[PDB]
Amino acid sequence: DRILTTRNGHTTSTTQSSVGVTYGYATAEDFVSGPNTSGLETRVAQAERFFKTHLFDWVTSDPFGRCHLLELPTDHKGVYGYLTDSYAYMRNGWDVEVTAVGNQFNGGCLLVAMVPELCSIQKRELYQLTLFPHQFINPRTNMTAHITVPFVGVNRYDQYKVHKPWTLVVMVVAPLTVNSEGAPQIKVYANIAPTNVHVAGEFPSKE
Amino acid sequence: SGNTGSIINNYYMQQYQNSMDTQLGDWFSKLASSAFSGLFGALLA
Amino acid sequence: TTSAGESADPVTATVENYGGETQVQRRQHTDVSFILDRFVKVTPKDQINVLDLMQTPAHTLVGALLRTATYYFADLEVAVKHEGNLTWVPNGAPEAALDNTTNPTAYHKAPLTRLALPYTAPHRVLATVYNGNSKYGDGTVANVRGDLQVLAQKAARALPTSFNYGAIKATRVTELLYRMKRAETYCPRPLLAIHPDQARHKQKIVAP
Amino acid sequence: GIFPVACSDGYGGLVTTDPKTADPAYGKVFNPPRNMLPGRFTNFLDVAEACPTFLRFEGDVPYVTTKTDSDRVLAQFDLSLAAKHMSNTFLAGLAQYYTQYSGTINLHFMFTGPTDAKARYMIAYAPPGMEPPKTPEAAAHCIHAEWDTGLNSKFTFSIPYLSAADYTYTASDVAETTNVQGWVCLFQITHGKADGDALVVLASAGKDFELRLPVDARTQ
Amino acid sequence: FNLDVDSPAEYSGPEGSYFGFAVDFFVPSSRMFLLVGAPKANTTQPGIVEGGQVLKCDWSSTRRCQPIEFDATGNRDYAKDDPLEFKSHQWFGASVRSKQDKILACAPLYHWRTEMKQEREPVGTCFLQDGTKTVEYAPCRSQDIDADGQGFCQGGFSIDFTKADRVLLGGPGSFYWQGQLISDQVAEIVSKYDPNVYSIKYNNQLATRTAQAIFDDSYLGYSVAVGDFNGDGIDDFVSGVPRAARTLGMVYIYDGKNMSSYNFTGEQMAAYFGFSVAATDINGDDYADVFIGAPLFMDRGSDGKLQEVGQVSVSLQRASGDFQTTKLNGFEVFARFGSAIAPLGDLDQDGFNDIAIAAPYGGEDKKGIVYIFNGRSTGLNAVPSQILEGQWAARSCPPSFGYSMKGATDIDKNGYPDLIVGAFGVDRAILYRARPVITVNAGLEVYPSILNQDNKTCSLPGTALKVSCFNVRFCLKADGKGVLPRKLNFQVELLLDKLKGAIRRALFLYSRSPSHSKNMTISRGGLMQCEELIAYLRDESEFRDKLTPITIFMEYRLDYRTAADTTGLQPILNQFTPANISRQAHILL
Numbered sequence A: 001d002r003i004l005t006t007r008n009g010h011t012t013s014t015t016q017s018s019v020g021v022t023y024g025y026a027t028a029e030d031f032v033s034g035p036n037t038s039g040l041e042t043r044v045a046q047a048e049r050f051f052k053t054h055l056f057d058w059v060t061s062d063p064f065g066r067c068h069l070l071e072l073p074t075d076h077k078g079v080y081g082y083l084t085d086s087y088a089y090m091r092n093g094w095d096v097e098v099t100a101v102g103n104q105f106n107g108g109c110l111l112v113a114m115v116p117e118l119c120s121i122q123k124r125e126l127y128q129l130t131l132f133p134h135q136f137i138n139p140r141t142n143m144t145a146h147i148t149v150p151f152v153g154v155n156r157y158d159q160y161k162v163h164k165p166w167t168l169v170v171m172v173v174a175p176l177t178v179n180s181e182g183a184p185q186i187k188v189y190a191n192i193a194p195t196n197v198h199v200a201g202e203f204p205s206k207e
Numbered sequence B: 001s002g003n004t005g006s007i008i009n010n011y012y013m014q015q016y017q018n019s020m021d022t023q024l025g026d027w028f029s030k031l032a033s034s035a036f037s038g039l040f041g042a043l044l045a
Numbered sequence C: 001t002t003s004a005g006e007s008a009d010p011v012t013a014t015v016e017n018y019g020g021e022t023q024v025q026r027r028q029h030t031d032v033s034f035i036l037d038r039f040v041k042v043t044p045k046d047q048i049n050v051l052d053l054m055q056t057p058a059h060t061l062v063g064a065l066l067r068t069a070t071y072y073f074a075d076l077e078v079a080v081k082h083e084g085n086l087t088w089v090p091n092g093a094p095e096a097a098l099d100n101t102t103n104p105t106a107y108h109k110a111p112l113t114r115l116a117l118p119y120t121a122p123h124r125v126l127a128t129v130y131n132g133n134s135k136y137g138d139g140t141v142a143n144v145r146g147d148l149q150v151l152a153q154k155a156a157r158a159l160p161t162s163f164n165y166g167a168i169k170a171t172r173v174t175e176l177l178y179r180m181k182r183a184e185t186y187c188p189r190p191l192l193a194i195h196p197d198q199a200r201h202k203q204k205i206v207a208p
Numbered sequence D: 001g002i003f004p005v006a007c008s009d010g011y012g013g014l015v016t017t018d019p020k021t022a023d024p025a026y027g028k029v030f031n032p033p034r035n036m037l038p039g040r041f042t043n044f045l046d047v048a049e050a051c052p053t054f055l056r057f058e059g060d061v062p063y064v065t066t067k068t069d070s071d072r073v074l075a076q077f078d079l080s081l082a083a084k085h086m087s088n089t090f091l092a093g094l095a096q097y098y099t100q101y102s103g104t105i106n107l108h109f110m111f112t113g114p115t116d117a118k119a120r121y122m123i124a125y126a127p128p129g130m131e132p133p134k135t136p137e138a139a140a141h142c143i144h145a146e147w148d149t150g151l152n153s154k155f156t157f158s159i160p161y162l163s164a165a166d167y168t169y170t171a172s173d174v175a176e177t178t179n180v181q182g183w184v185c186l187f188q189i190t191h192g193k194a195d196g197d198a199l200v201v202l203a204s205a206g207k208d209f210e211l212r213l214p215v216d217a218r219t220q
Numbered sequence E: 001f002n003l004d005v006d007s008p009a010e011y012s013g014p015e016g017s018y019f020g021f022a023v024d025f026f027v028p029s030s031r032m033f034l035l036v037g038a039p040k041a042n043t044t045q046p047g048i049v050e051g052g053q054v055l056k057c058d059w060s061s062t063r064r065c066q067p068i069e070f071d072a073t074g075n076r077d078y079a080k081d082d083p084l085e086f087k088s089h090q091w092f093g094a095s096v097r098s099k100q101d102k103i104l105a106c107a108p109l110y111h112w113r114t115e116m117k118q119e120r121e122p123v124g125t126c127f128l129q130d131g132t133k134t135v136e137y138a139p140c141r142s143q144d145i146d147a148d149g150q151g152f153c154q155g156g157f158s159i160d161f162t163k164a165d166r167v168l169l170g171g172p173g174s175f176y177w178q179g180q181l182i183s184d185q186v187a188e189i190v191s192k193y194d195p196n197v198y199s200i201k202y203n204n205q206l207a208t209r210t211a212q213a214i215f216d217d218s219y220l221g222y223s224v225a226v227g228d229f230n231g232d233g234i235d236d237f238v239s240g241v242p243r244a245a246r247t248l249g250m251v252y253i254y255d256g257k258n259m260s261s262y263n264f265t266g267e268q269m270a271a272y273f274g275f276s277v278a279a280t281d282i283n284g285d286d287y288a289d290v291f292i293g294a295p296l297f298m299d300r301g302s303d304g305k306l307q308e309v310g311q312v313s314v315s316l317q318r319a320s321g322d323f324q325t326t327k328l329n330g331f332e333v334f335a336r337f338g339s340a341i342a343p344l345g346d347l348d349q350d351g352f353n354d355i356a357i358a359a360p361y362g363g364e365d366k367k368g369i370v371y372i373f374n375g376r377s378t379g380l381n382a383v384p385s386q387i388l389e390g391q392w393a394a395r396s397c398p399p400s401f402g403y404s405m406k407g408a409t410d411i412d413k414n415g416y417p418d419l420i421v422g423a424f425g426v427d428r429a430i431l432y433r434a435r436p437v438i439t440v441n442a443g444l445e446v447y448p449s450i451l452n453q454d455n456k457t458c459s460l461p462g463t464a465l466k467v468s469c470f471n472v473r474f475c476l477k478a479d480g481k482g483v484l485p486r487k488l489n490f491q492v493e494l495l496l497d498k499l500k501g502a503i504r505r506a507l508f509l510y511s512r513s514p515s516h517s518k519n520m521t522i523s524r525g526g527l528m529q530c531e532e533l534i535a536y537l538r539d540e541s542e543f544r545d546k547l548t549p550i551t552i553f554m555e556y557r558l559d560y561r562t563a564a565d566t567t568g569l570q571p572i573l574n575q576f577t578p579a580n581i582s583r584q585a586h587i588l589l
């Protein structure tokens, strides 16, 4: 009764322990045809695929609130990051997918959250990270969390060299409790993908 | 409508009072109304 | 209600699950357009005051409740007690245009002069804390402590100097008050109440 | 002649919350379009009802640890929105700017133990009037509920709103130190090999939770 | 009291080089030397003005002070046209500590460019030399950096060796001046050395970690001392934290095995409690006693006026774990008594260790004073048995005689430990030698002591009349430890009726005189020498005074000139030992 294998473009991602995809803040995209671009935008369909990245190593000595904040977009050394140095104005959503593979005998949990415009946080502020598009990961139930968000922003197209709208945040809510039969150290990976990018305005070539 | 309490019409029209909004061509009320309730298994009385 | 504990879809185990019933609930006092359009005091400078809404304090009601939103749209009307003549200037004009009287001055009428300003920003929606390229941030590194620390706090301040409703300039403003109407908010942020050191934060409530 | 009026006395002062709108000064402004922009909320309770936020326990942590001894009280906190345990919750964030409320408060209980550790718990509501119960035998006579840890690992228990008056104060009294609105107690009844394992708790606004009469907390 | 002041060894250096800012002894394996720190001395290092150097001063024969090359190089580069370090004015030699073949010197104001951005942070550095070996030791020069890290650590501001050959290093600037104690074994300092690695990790390193922000600006590691305090043999870490507890000053003691936390605290604001610390067993109970200095302490006099005199807190270590703290105040106002505290070992070889405390800005013309305090059973004798005076005038910076000093080293093999005093303000360093202590068992017997005026036993040659006589008898016996002559000639003086312009009622028989001297020559450790003679009473009708007791006085003086040895180090007689004794005799009626 379960369709649990996502794909974006020509790359797939099958997980067998998906509790469900959480659509944050919208189920559909905004009007991409703005009046601040005079109709000179175009969709690049070849930017929609996953790209893997490493986040941290959740070990047993990590207390509450060992958070990790990577700003999206990060250094993409493929097709998507070519558009950052070749087009000035661009917009996109994201559909992140973090993996924390241990086994079903570890304990603890780590919250995953896509949060816009995130800087200067407190550890007393971490209590209310649930407000954002979030999805828990505990090894007793699942291994992945699959969050999808649209383009938010102050204005319709963005300059990603001077601005980073989203921030993938993973923090640890309960510490990793290994047992006699669990896994000692788990490593948190993530494959991130854009959704329906739209560039506008060609830079001159660097030559 | 806000924190207005007047039944009379405004004196200044609509565009010397506010800034007019422009269409081009909500969420958490739909999110809080799709909340699951009841139980998960076969209940008794 | 037993649920799927990690899917993060909303679940509301109501009070009917162990007998009983729910009552009709009214939520007018928690509406976002009702709770934000009342006057709040900010501290003024002597003459020139940019009409940014993020200079409202963080302890007051609609300053700590405006920072609940990431993105906000609201028309501002101010109420300022001054002496002299107070010229409002729209968004992005040169600050030498505060002296000119063709800009919408209000002559001194005792005691104070309230006037309704439009949303003059170029952006579709303003924002509470824009972070183009100021914060990383997943764990800022130890940099400045001791004396230098006080100035180091303004390192992370907001940059879209286009996040303002304009500026007002008088001879000496004494107390200028903000309120924001037709307020639309987007993308909520965490809201914090102060930390009790006792079993419960007991303060002296009003009593005859 | 002209239309005679009487400039009435006592009226017309500046009130900070009045429904009088100020006279415009600069018209003909057309905003940039904002329609169907993502993530809009209308009332602050819908954020508080659709998004649960953690609690606070001893050690600045949201989780409560299972207890391998004869004492079976996991947590026992008084029921107010100015409590110590409820302090970091978003629900008590906006209830710091009001005076009185009514309605249910959902508590969400997620168990984060391994697949071989099993336990069962109970949560009871002790209404005010005598001392709160210290054993799960004594707390069986409250409006309680039990659940055990299995496949679905989350439990949501809606705190009933029992009161004499129709609305109860969200600010616990400064001098009066008995907390005569109520206690809520959660225990463990047993656990199988669940030592050192956690139970992260959350709180949300209920289905019929509504606040009333806004004031200014002013970081107090 | 036994220190030589007549002709002490003087050593000098370049003017302005601060010759004497730090001093120590160097005893390798069989010549003896002196180490003087000159942190402002110019070097031949390429393009480095006032790099500072440490000088090995030959005590044997001439007074030559040959500099020691720990580092002859200039500023290494991080990249092309990008200096890695700044050895200019690095104050190398500001702290010098030696143990057998190992000499450790440091540069507290050595600055270092980060391996990232181009900064100039005073992490401080040190150079450890083991005979032919010479490595660099910069524990604060790490990946942890500026202000909140170890960037402003100034590692090497104070240093000390333990008995298990482990280095103790202090840096008052770590973690926003919280300060840091760093301890490494001398094995790994050289074994893990790498000329191409600027931040060396040591596997067995003990260190104080960073603490809460309220501990900032406390200056831990300002001064250091070593001694055992938990009774496990391993030297523990004593350090002054002079700005801790809102400028009240504290002193921390950590375990020398795992850096586990006693804690001392001051009584007065801004008295600089912890400016100097010292650990030595002062009461012979083999329990290391803590000495803490607070040069800025103000005391009240009989006029009830505050006066800055300085204070040292003597904390005796009891087996109970507690301390028996005694406070010792300064003597001159604004002299900053307690700036330097130096264990001397058993200076007089009496059975208890001794200690020296200095008031560098005291004495006439701000020359400087060093006070010598002797230890005993009850603790430290609060009265100084000797007062060492500076002999040099000021130029710009005051002579600072006593600002740094080192003792507890028998450098001349006389059986008695010596003392170095550094006066950097005049670029001088002074070695005081300890003179051999001679204990002397003097004796005096008068028999009979009850004189019968009508006895008339002893006849008197020249007259048919006989006189009432009696016997006087004096004895000498002396012995001493260390190196000293086996023959000892003394000058004994005897006076009859010492109490008396007045008439003396008794005189010696074979001289007819109340005064008699005897050149006596006894042997060290040898038997007691004893010469006796006959004294007689005057005739009854020669004086009326018959009630006043006739006091017999014996006094002796040692020939110091002939007791001198090789260099001319003349022995001295023990303190608290009467140089003269007196017995009396009565007449009846």
Ligand SMILES: *[C@@H]1O[C@H](CO)[C@@H](O[C@@H]2O[C@H](CO)[C@@H](O[C@H]3O[C@H](CO)[C@@H](O)[C@H](O[C@@H]4O[C@H](CO)[C@@H](O)[C@H](O)[C@@H]4O)[C@@H]3O)[C@H](O)[C@H]2NC(C)=O)[C@H](O)[C@H]1NC(C)=O
Pocket (backbone or CB within 6 Å): E446, E447, E448, E450, E451, E452, E455, E456, E457, E458, E468, E469, E470, E471, E534
């Ligand atoms: C009168 O005058 C004569 C001459 O001056 C006195 O002669 C003295 O007699 C002393 C007692 O005999 C004598 O003492 C020393 O010699 C003793 C043996 O003759 C000997 O026994 C003593 O040892 C002991 O003596 C000490 C003395 O302090 C006592 O304390 C002990 O208890 C022991 O008895 C002495 O070695 C002394 O040498 C001698 N002196 C002279 C100059 O002849 C005589 O005592 C006088 N008598 C009166 C009237 O007082």
Ligand SMILES: [Ca+2]
Pocket (backbone or CB within 6 Å): E227, E228, E229, E230, E231, E232, E233, E234, E235, E236, E255, E256, E257
């Ligand atoms: Ca020890």
Ligand SMILES: [Ca+2]
Pocket (backbone or CB within 6 Å): E281, E282, E283, E284, E285, E286, E287, E288, E289, E316, E317
């Ligand atoms: Ca002792």
Ligand SMILES: [Ca+2]
Pocket (backbone or CB within 6 Å): E345, E346, E347, E348, E349, E350, E351, E352, E353, E354, E374, E375
């Ligand atoms: Ca001694």
Ligand SMILES: [Ca+2]
Pocket (backbone or CB within 6 Å): E410, E411, E412, E413, E414, E415, E416, E417, E418, E433, E434, E435
């Ligand atoms: Ca000697």
